[PDB]
Structures are given as C-alpha cells and as structure tokens.
Amino acid sequence: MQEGKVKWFNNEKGYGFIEVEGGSDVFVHFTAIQGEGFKTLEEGQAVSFEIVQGNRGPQAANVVKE
C-alpha cells in the first residue's frame, strides 16, 4: 500500500483528500473506505491505501484507517 494522512474529509458530502509526503493530494470517496465503522474519515487520520485511475484521474482505493 501507500501511507498518508487525511488532509480533510467532509462527512456530509462523503469525500475529501489524503495528503502524501512528496506527492499530490489524492481524492478519497467514502465508497473506498474499509471496515465496519462509519465510512468517514477525519483530518489528520492516518490511512493506508492504493492509488487507482478513475475517469477523473487518481483516486484512493482500499482505504484502511490506522
């Protein structure tokens, strides 16, 4: 995987961005979030994830809350 920190996440809209050291912020949608908790993230949360290419460009897949 790839490690990052959530930059921001809007729990009403269901999306945000993950900040990665020395790379561009990666879009994250709630549908990519793993686990049985609520499909939400909060600023500063540590996550692991894969980058995939969707029709709008890079986005996160397999987002696991650490």
Under the criterion CB under 8 A, does residue 25 sit at the interface with a second copy?
no
**Phi-psi label, residue 36: left if phi above 0, alpha if psi -120 to 50, beta otherwise:** alpha
Q: How far apart are CA 38 and CA 21, in angstroms?
A: 26
Given candidates 24, 42, 43, 52, which one binds a second copy under the rule CB under 8 A?
52
Query: 9 vs 59, which CB is nearer to a second copy?
Result: 59
Cα–Cα dist 2/20, whole Å: 9
Cβ nearer to a second copy, comparing 31 with 43: 31
Of 5, 8, 34, 48, the residue at the interface with a second copy (CB under 8 A) is 34
